[PDB]
Amino acid sequence: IQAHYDVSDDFFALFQDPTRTYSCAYFEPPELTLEEAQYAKVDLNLDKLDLKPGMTLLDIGCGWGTTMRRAVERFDVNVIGLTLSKNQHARCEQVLASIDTNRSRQVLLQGWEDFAEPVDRIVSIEAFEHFGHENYDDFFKRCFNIMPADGRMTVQSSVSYHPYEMAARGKKLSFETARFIKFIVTEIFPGGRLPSTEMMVEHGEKAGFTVPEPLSLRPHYIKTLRIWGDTLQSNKDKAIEVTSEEVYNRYMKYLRGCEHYFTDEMLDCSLVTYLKPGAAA
Numbered sequence: 138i139q140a141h142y143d144v145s146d147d148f149f150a151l152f153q154d155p156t157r158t159y160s161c162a163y164f165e166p167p168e169l170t171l172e173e174a175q176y177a178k179v180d181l182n183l184d185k186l187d188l189k190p191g192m193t194l195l196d197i198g199c200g201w202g203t204t205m206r207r208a209v210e211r212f213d214v215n216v217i218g219l220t221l222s223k224n225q226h227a228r229c230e231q232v233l234a235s236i237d238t239n240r241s242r243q244v245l246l247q248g249w250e251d252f253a254e255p256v257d258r259i260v261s262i263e264a265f266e267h268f269g270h271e272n273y274d275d276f277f278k279r280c281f282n283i284m285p286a287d288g289r290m291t292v293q294s295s296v297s298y299h300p301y302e303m304a305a306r307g308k309k310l311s312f313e314t315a316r317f318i319k320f321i322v323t324e325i326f327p328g329g330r331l332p333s334t335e336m337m338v339e340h341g342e343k344a345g346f347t348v349p350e351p352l353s354l355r356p357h358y359i360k361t362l363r364i365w366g367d368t369l370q371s372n373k374d375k376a377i378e379v380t381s382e383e384v385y386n387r388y389m390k391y392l393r394g395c396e397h398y399f400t401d402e403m404l405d406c407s408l409v410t411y412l413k414p415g416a417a418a
């Protein structure tokens with residue numbers, strides 16, 4: 138009965154930009170539209186990956202396929218995307234099928250747990266918080282093992298802090314943040330779990346990866362969540378029509394709540410890079 142909290146693609150179209158990106162944008166230049174800023178976040182990730190023409194890139198949690206398209210277009214690489222959504226899958230094939238390229242392009246309806254084919258490079262933008270702590274060793278091991286000697290991966294993920302770190306900020310705020318996080322992980326992304334940055338880093342390291350200092354995206358998620366919130370708000374009535382007032386207020390609280398806790402430095406978002414020992418310098 139986890140599917141009570143399932144919301145239709147229609148609803149998400151009433152807050153997200155045209156690319157249907159459901160992750161932190163990168164406003165650099167700061168004057169970028171959200172849509173521009175989502176392309177910019179995609180580039181930010183891919184440009185870390187030492188992609189060369191004819192490599193195969195893996196997108197773990199590929200959504201609507203925008204990352205994969207931009208990759209094949211910009212880097213002339215083959216792509217493979219993993220998604221758990223039947224709709225995302227059909228969309229992705231259509232998106233990929235339209236590209237003017239001899240490059241191989243492929244999208245699978247399944248998790249990384251079931252993927253074990255050799256790829257050169259890996260991107261994963263905000264799928265990670267769906268995985269669960271219990272699965273982290275197996276994730277970084279799978280990723281290390283499917284890549285060549287020079288492999289690289291980025292993982293972008295919202296992040297919380299260890300209950301120890303949060304107490305330093307005061308108990309009132311620490312229990313309040315804990316409850317909000319439970320909310321996210323229950324009603325927004327059922328079964329989810331926010332890692333901390335330190336977990337992202339150390340699991341990567343235990344698997345054999347070199348991990349430079351993660352990049353914080355916090356102010357960008359502030360701006361993203363502002364625009365997401367404002368957009369849903371301005372579409373209040375269509376939103377309710379497509380779902381319920383329940384669903385609507387649920388998402389307004391998510392967007393405004395995250396924006397608030399990010400502003401309060403109670404949440405973060407890290408773009409972590411994992412480099413195999415043979416990665417290019």
Ligand SMILES: Nc1ncnc2c1ncn2[C@@H]1O[C@H](CSCC[C@H](N)C(=O)O)[C@@H](O)[C@H]1O
Nearest residue numbers: 158159160198200221248249262263264267
């Ligand atoms: N175990 C898993 N393996 C592969 N994808 C997973 C997964 N668990 C969740 N996901 C996927 O992760 C994606 C997170 S939403 C973000 C999608 C896209 N990268 C973007 O930035 O917009 C969804 O496609 C969801 O189905």
